[PDB]
Design a binder for this molecule. Structure first.
Ligand SMILES: Nc1ncnc2c1ncn2[C@@H]1O[C@H](COP(=O)(O)OP(=O)(O)OP(=O)(O)O)[C@@H](O)[C@H]1O
Ligand SMILES: [Mg+2]
Ligand SMILES: [Mg+2]
Lengths: 179, 495, 53, 366
């Protein structure tokens, strides 16, 4: 999804070109108005803190013993059928506090322990299959180490490595890289 | 010529096949056909537009008599206008046979036909300019109804025209209060957009025609918003030396003068990227009205923030939208502040899924708690990707149809007439040039349909007036052609 | 009595069970649809002969 | 955090009061399944998942016609009263077969199959679109098509293309998904598939590579394959089986036509058989054009000569020549190809890799 870093990787100037300076100052002015924009409205309208009050109310709406279950089907929005812990299916009501986007049919769901409903999705544990074949780094064998085979190293370089380092070549002749 | 003849394939696209891909709705009813005109009227609107530019692709016109009988007496008046849309850009082809049948009864049906004339005659910019000669006579003729249709078409047909004779001529018709209010009100919007320069004489005169109105009409009108819009674009680029007269002479007026004066400032300051000018709008304006009963003003304040922010080097667009969600909806007022939904689609409306639509607007589209709230957001989505030519759009459209407010009729036509209409092919709606920083002064007309749908007194919900939702379309074509003097033809590729 | 008789039946939710052994030491042993067995001393509002194992 | 933190602005849009207004007034129900409708007036017999089989009647707002035997319905958690009918359960592995995104290929990237394409549109792209033409005559349009040919001829492309224009729902099937561990549930995926399709007024099923579950009936006295055979029978029985199949129009393409049961290859199920033979001279001269468009060329290239240098070259072997001829230009560092580059391409993809190939040992369909 969204990336925390890389706000604007506009390194095209790649130099002391003034264009770098203009964009940076733009955010500064916007930041200044936002500062007194939030705190000012946060005094005469002490309803939601957004930092301690926002989280606090939802926790009460949640339950101390948060439940874990499998979402089995997606009935109309705000409504879903979630398989209970052991073997039961409940026609629970989806709460808007959830992102409402990660609700894949069968991943995971957190439910209140008394009025069971959807309270939140749970990230799925890395399945053991992925870890089985997820080679991290080739220990020691380099590419000049192989030696010997020369005309045969160009084919592999040109099928599984070039289209990822210099896509332009299979970008201007309109040819998809060998499968 | 090069699209159908040279190309071997030439298939037809009936409307029924794709009208209802999901069959859940038809299950259970097992037919149960009804003669409701509300259902029939909406369906015709969707079908009519898609059949444009299809001379031989017409099937519901030869035997269309039956459709006329299945509706109310007054329903056909709104549907009468849609007939003209089929024969788009027909200077004289369609009018040749209409004249011979003019000498006939049923003059009431003729009222709806004229509305179509304005759209077809818009953009041709004929040197002889036949629109006035073929429209002036009926306007001056003494009848509220027959000239009622002529009022809407005249403004749209002359978007590029800026002759002062028409603008002054139209003033008396709207200035005569002896006729229907709607007749004057609907006209006032058209005249505002025609003049994009200064037009000092009429801009001040237009203000006068609004000043000498009773407090009840001025306060509770629900129709005076468009008045500054025409003036706002008619005073763009003016400095403080010009607004000094307006401010000095507007110091002995009612507090409503502050309400209207706000719009002019933004339009005049087209490019004024800054923080000091924007701040008092949100904070000072919001706090002051909390001690009085005046309302319906903060909504316009937020929608106009798009100006001088459309093209922030393609970097301020994402930042601006984020603040709105956490500011205007996070803790804003319950109704007015929460109704800042049509602002997001106004800033950038071309179609960019997964980064600016699913998160910002798609989340609020399922607000089943209040159908009225969904009304603004349901129409908001269609505006920004009406014709994006993207095949990965229909999945979301079906995510609500058949799974939300289906029993209610008021919410029924909100989605069907708009959500299913986003499939129009070979069409583009972006107006920015290739550079993306130089906007078109007359191309910014896609701003009127951003508060009228909110109230809906004889605007959208009430049948009788729906051309307001058809006139704001002003864009270019998406087809590029190459040819030679002797019709040689090349196959040069593009990337 | 009918008012009181309906009161127990008025609790419409029943628990379906299969009769296991209609012992005559006219009693019945049932096996509710929850894997629980019982020894209803009195058959209840049903004949003692219409009930076959 | 890290569990369900959504846009905070949307939480207030959630109207926590309404959520409390919904986290109390709205009773949570439990799924169930009806077995009987004991007569008298109400008295519905119910079967919760794994608690018991209770007896329930109604609450107030569910019309008696709204409920029928064997229908999913929610129930109260305290008194067990039906409150809302629930949708039937479709196996998630069978519900993932529905294509939600159309493949990006149209009926203009397949060349030489003019007759095949035309014969594949009067059974899957005309009965549904313009369905009134056949009404003014007594014709039940053929329902089902078998596409067979040597590997890499275009069986899937002509199918992937039909899904790009079809208006009715398109359902995938690979022919290996219908193989499952336990006896039984290899026909459930073939019973659920058609139940889902019948819920759609127009539906197409593409049984791609129907050879793993479409074999011939073979009794060796040693308990040969039987689960796959049972699954095939269910497929055969759901196309013409004493029950109108509906509007489902099957479309199965097989690499090995001479292996199918002589019951899946009769009119009624797999009605029309479309042969995908190796392209002829006019054909492979057209495949070259459809694959060498978005590439740099000498313009003056004898594509016909290249077509005649690979007589029995499948469609795939022609794209590999085009995708490889430009490869010889990336290596020389040039940016515009040449005929000599293509000729070296044919010498490598057609005559140099002919040792392995697939065409010589498949045109016998064995
Ligand atoms: N007539 C054709 N025109 C263009 N490309 C073709 C043609 N026939 C095959 N191809 C190419 O074949 C490739 C895909 O082959 P495809 O899987 O459709 O073949 P197949 O023989 O039906 O497959 P299989 O037997 O392996 O299931 C694509 O790259 C496509 O360009
Ligand atoms: Mg295949
Ligand atoms: Mg046959």
């Amino acid at each position: 999804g969204p990336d925390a870093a890389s706000k604007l990787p506009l390194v095209t100037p790649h130099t002391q070109c003034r264009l770098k300076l203009l964009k940076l100052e733009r955010i500064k002015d916007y930041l200044l108005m936002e500062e007194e924009f939030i705190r000012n409205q946060e005094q005469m309208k002490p309803l939601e803190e957004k930092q301690e009050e926002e989280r606090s109310k939802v926790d009460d709406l949640r339950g101390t013993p948060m439940s874990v279950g499998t979402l089995e089907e997606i009935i109309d929005d705000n409504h879903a059928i979630v398989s209970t812990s052991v073997g039961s299916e409940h026609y629970v009501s989806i709460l808007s506090f959830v992102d409402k986007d990660l609700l894949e049919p069968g991943c995971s769901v957190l439910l209140n322990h008394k009025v069971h409903a959807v309270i939140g999705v749970l990230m799925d544990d890395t399945d053991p299959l992925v870890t089985v074949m997820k080679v991290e780094k080739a220990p020691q064998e380099t590419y000049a180490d192989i030696g010997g085979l020369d005309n045969q190293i160009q084919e592999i370089k040109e099928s599984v490595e070039l289209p990822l380092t210099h896509p332009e070549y299979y970008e201007e002749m309109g040819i998809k890289p060998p499968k | 010529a090069l699209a159908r003849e040279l190309d071997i394939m030439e298939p037809k696209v009936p409307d029924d096949i794709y009208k209802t891909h999901l069959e859940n709705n038809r299950f259970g009813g097992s037919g149960s056909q009804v003669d409701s005109a509300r259902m029939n009227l909406a369906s015709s609107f969707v079908n009519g537009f898609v059949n444009a530019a299809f001379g031989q692709d017409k099937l519901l016109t030869d035997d269309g008599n039956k459709w006329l009988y299945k509706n109310k007496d007054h329903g056909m008046l709104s549907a009468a206008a849609s007939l003209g849309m089929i024969l788009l850009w027909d200077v004289d082809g369609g009018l040749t046979q209409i004249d011979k049948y003019l000498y006939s009864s049923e003059d009431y049906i003729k009222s709806g036909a004229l509305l179509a004339c304005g759209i077809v005659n818009s953009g041709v910019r004929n040197e002889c300019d036949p629109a006035l000669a073929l429209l002036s006579d009926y306007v001056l003729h003494n009848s509220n109804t027959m000239r009622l249709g002529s009022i809407f078409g005249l403004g749209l047909a002359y978007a590029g025209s800026n002759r002062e004779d028409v603008l002054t001529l139209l003033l008396p018709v709207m200035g005569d209060s002896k006729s229907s209010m709607e007749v004057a009100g609907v006209t006032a919007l058209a005249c505002g957009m025609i003049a994009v320069g200064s037009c000092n004489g009429d801009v001040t005169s237009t203000i006068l025609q609004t000043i000498m109105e009773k407090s009840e009409t001025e306060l509770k009108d629900t129709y005076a918003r468009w008045l500054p819009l025409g003036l706002g674009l008619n005073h763009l680029g003016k400095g403080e030396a010009i607004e000094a007269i307006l401010a000095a002479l507007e110091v002995v007026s009612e507090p409503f003068r502050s309400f209207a004066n706000t719009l002019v400032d933004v339009c005049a300051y087209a490019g004024s990227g800054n923080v000091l000018k924007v701040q008092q709008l949100l904070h000072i304006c919001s706090e002051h009205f909390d001690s009085k009963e005046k309302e319906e003003d903060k909504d316009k304040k937020e929608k106009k923030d798009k100006d001088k922010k459309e093209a922030p080097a393609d970097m301020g667009a994402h930042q601006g939208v984020a603040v709105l969600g956490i500011a205007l909806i996070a803790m804003g007022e319950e109704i007015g502040a929460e109704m800042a939904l049509r602002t997001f689609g106004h800033l950038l409306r071309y179609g960019e899924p997964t980064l600016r639509r699913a998160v910002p607007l798609a989340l609020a589209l399922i607000s089943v708690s209040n159908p009225r709230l969904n009304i603004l957001d349901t129409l908001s989505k269609f505006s920004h990707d009406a014709d994006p030519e993207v095949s990965y759009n229909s999945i979301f459209a079906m995510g609500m149809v058949g799974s939300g407010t289906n029993n209610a009729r008021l919410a029924a036509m909100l989605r069907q007439l708009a959500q299913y209409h986003a499939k129009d092919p070979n069409n583009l709606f972006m107006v920015r040039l290739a550079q993306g920083l130089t906007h078109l002064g007359k191309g910014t007309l896609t701003l009127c349909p951003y508060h009228s749908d909110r109230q809906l007194m004889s605007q959208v919900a009430v049948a009788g007036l729906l051309t307001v939702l058809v006139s704001f379309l002003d864009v270019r074509n998406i087809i590029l052609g190459k040819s030679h003097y002797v019709l040689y033809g090349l196959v040069a590729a593009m990337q | 009595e009918n008012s009181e008789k309906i009161k127990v039946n008025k609790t419409l939710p029943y628990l379906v069970s299969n009769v296991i052994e209609l012992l005559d030491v006219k009693c019945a042993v049932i096996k509710t649809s929850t894997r629980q067995t019982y020894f209803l001393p009195v058959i209840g509002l049903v004949d003692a002969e219409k009930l076959k194992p | 955090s890290d569990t369900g933190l959504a846009p905070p602005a949307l939480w207030d849009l959630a109207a926590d009061k309404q959520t409390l207004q919904s986290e109390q007034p709205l009773q949570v129900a439990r799924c169930t399944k009806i077995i009987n409708a004991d007569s008298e007036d109400p008295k519905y017999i119910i079967n919760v998942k794994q608690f018991a089989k209770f007896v329930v009647d109604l609450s107030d707002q569910v019309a008696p016609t709204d409920i029928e035997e064997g229908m999913r319905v929610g129930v109260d958690r305290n008194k067990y009263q039906i409150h809302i009918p629930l949708p039937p359960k479709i196996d998630p592995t069978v519900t993932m077969m529905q294509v939600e995104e159309k493949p990006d290929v149209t009926y203009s990237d397949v060349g030489g199959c003019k007759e095949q394409i035309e014969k594949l549109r009067e059974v899957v792209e005309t009965p549904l679109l313009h369905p009134e033409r056949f009404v003014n005559l007594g014709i039940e349009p053929p329902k089902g098509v078998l596409l067979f040919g040597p590997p890499g001829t275009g069986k899937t492309l002509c199918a992937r293309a039909v899904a790009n224009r079809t208006d009715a729902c398109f359902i995938r099937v690979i022919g290996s998904e219908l193989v499952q561990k336990y006896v039984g549930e290899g026909a459930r995926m073939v019973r659920e598939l058609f139940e889902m399709a019948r819920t759609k007024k127009a539906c197409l099923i593409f049984f791609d590579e129907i050879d793993a579950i479409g074999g011939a009936r073979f009794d060796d006295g040693a308990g040969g394959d039987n689960e796959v055979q049972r699954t095939m029978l269910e497929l055969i029985n759901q196309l013409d089986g004493f029950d109108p199949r509906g509007n489902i129009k099957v479309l199965m393409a097989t690499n090995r036509p001479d292996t199918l049961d002589p019951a899946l290859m009769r009119p009624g199920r797999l009605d029309r058989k479309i042969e995908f033979s190796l392209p002829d001279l006019e054909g492979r001269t057209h495949i070259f054009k459809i694959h060498a468009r978005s590439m740099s060329v000498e313009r003056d290239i004898r594509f016909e000569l290249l077509a005649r240098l690979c007589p029995n070259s499948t469609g795939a072997e022609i794209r590999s020549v085009c995708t490889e001829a430009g490869m010889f230009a990336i290596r020389a560092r040039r940016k515009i190809a040449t005929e000599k580059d293509f000729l070296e391409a044919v010498n490598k993809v057609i005559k140099s890799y002919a040792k392995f190939s697939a065409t010589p040992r498949y045109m016998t369909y064995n």
